[PDB]
Design a binder for this molecule. Structure first.
Ligand SMILES: CC[C@H](C)[C@H](N)C(=O)O
Ligand SMILES: [Cl-]
Length: 565
């Protein structure tokens, strides 16, 4: 009768604005606060850290603070930084429940020590509002240029600026009486690295002097930290796909658990982020196993669902990908691996047919981005086009995430290309469509479900008009799915996305399974020999876990970010 844990594996999700510091006091003279903290890489990767932080009070804390077992503190931050300056702002709000809706005026921070034995030292002034939990800080180097990421000194760059619901925090209480606290903080990194910070404070009226002594060690030398690859989260090349999964998934789970759940037992999503990165997707998978989670919804890109699939199979963990389409993944005899989507093979053949039958252009160019998906899809299509005598002029590739297509654009122009197929994902396609119509090509473009999203429209504007896509059918127009569509809307979320539906269908799949056996093997056996009613229709699977008789369907794309037959 425990809740049943399902892993949902997104990609390049923002995550929550506020961080939970949990706060416990085991004695009158000690406060311990626990932190989870992911950084993000100028790449959209996640570097995961866990903090323990210890406050020593020279005088015992009044009884009121102790009688109020777990306090919860929500904190956000911002950092602008050069190689020499930093500028930082913190908002902090205390509550006694995990549900989110003279005192100090000025301070200084001397923050010094070492990172992988590279000494650093910074100094500078700041202010805050002890009533509201706001603080700000400027900091200048007294040595030279940080040869590490300044986002590693974040959080560590003044809890005397908090307050509790009905008064002063313990931290403030301690400043006003003069007896004070000290702070040890310790950070574990997923990659073995380690950071120690010790904090002493003097008070001079309402001004604070912070001393902060910093020992970091065994950061990998081409890690995010030693490499300055750390950024705030900026939307990433697959944020659209992760967001559509999470949406379809959170609706589904609500709707299931309302209907009473599996057999009394409710489902609980445990969110993970693999960044569609091979290594990270392998960190995620090892964590999934270790967390006792036996059913996985996700790994969205082929490139990251392969590496992940190995561990899951190796561990007796069920994995339904609602999104990864490269046929490789179900072509290696794995038994615990299912799909709520089709394959590049059928997706490239659908295209070629629509080009040979219903377009018939004169001069074809085939472009891809060189990854499994894109090249994969271009080879189907090329092969379909070759067999129907279509006049394919050149097949070519580009790097993912360059913004400059002046070379491809001048070349489609020089060679009077009226049609182009682009195997790949929306960022590159977006720029193509847009830098094309800028240069005044009348060229007609085509893409797979990877470009069939609202972000394509966001990048391209009017250029997106007339783009041809292959994509799953529009199940958001099917009357059964009306209720679901309304709920997504109630939440201001966009239900047209296909991964919303595939994801929703993948949970329903898991549902049917779970209703006999909590065992990952019988589920895969059951599902393979039975049809499930889902938001996509009935869903028979085959013995390698591919959906039987899945047809993508070909659609006209529009600058509004909808799509018609
Ligand atoms: C999110 C899925 C992406 C677009 C594609 N189907 C792939 O296998 O990489
Ligand atoms: Cl803290």
């Amino acid at each position: 009768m425990e809740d049943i844990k399902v892993a949902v594996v997104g990609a390049m999700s923002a995550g929550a604005d506020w961080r939970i510091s949990k706060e416990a006091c085991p004695n009158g003279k000690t406060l311990i606060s626990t932190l989870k903290w992911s950084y993000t890489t100028g790449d959209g990767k996640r570097y995961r850290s866990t903090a323990r932080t210890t406050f020593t009070f020279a005088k015992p804390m009044a009884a009121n603070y102790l009688k109020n077992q777990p306090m919860y503190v929500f904190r956000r931050t911002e950092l602008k930084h050069s190689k020499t300056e930093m500028d930082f702002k913190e908002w902090q709000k205390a509550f006694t429940d995990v549900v989110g809706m003279s005192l100090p005026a000025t301070h200084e921070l001397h923050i010094f020590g070492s990172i992988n034995g590279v000494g650093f030292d910074m100094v500078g002034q700041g202010s805050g509002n002890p009533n509201v939990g706001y603080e700000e800080l400027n900091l200048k180097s007294t040595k030279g240029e940080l040869q590490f990421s300044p986002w590693i000194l974040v959080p560590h760059i003044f809890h005397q600026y908090l307050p509790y619901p009905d008064g002063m925090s313990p931290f403030q209480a301690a400043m006003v009486d003069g007896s004070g606290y000290q702070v040890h903080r310790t950070v574990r990194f997923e990659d073995g690295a380690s950071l120690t910070v010790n904090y002493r404070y003097t008070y001079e009226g309402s001004h604070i002097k912070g001393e902060a002594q910093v020992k970091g060690t065994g950061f990998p030398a081409d890690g995010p930290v030693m490499t300055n690859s750390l950024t705030a989260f900026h939307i990433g090349p697959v944020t659209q796909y992760g967001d559509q999964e999470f949406t379809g998934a959170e609706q589904a789970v609500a709707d299931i658990n309302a209907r009473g759940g599996i057999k009394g037992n409710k489902l609980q999503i445990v969110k993970y982020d693999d960044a569609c990165d091979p290594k990270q997707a392998v960190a995620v998978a090892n964590r999934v196993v270790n967390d006792g989670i036996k059913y996985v919804i996700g790994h969205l890109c082929s490139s990251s669902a392969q590496p992940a699939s190995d561990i899951y199979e190796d561990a007796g963990i069920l994995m339904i990908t609602p999104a990864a389409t490269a046929p490789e993944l179900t072509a290696r005899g794995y038994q615990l691996i299912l799909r709520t989507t089709g394959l590049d093979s059928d997706q490239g053949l659908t295209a070629a047919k629509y080009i040979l039958e219903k377009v018939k252009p004169q001069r074809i160019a085939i472009v891809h981005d060189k990854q499994q998906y894109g090249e994969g899809l271009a080879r189907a299509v090329q092969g379909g086009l070759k067999k129907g005598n279509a006049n394919v002029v050149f097949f070519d590739g580009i790097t993912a995430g360059e913004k400059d297509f002046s070379t491809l654009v001048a070349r489609l122009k020089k060679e009077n290309i009226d049609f182009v197929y682009y195997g790949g994902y929306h960022p590159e396609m977006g720029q193509i469509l847009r830098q094309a119509r800028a240069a005044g090509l009348k060229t007609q473009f085509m893409g797979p479900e990877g470009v069939a999203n609202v972000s394509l429209s966001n990048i391209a504007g009017e250029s997106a008009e007339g783009l041809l896509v292959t994509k799953p059918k529009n199940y958001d127009q099917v009357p059964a799915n009306k209720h679901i569509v309304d709920a997504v809307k109630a939440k201001k979320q966009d239900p047209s996305g296909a991964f919303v539906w595939t994801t929703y269908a993948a949970l329903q799949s898991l549902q049917a399974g779970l209703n006999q056996s909590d065992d990952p093997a019988e589920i895969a056996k059951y599902l393979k020999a039975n049809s499930v009613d889902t938001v996509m229709g009935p869903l028979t699977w085959d013995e390698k876990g591919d959906l039987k008789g899945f047809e993508f369907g070909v659609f006209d794309w529009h600058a509004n970010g909808t799509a018609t037959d």
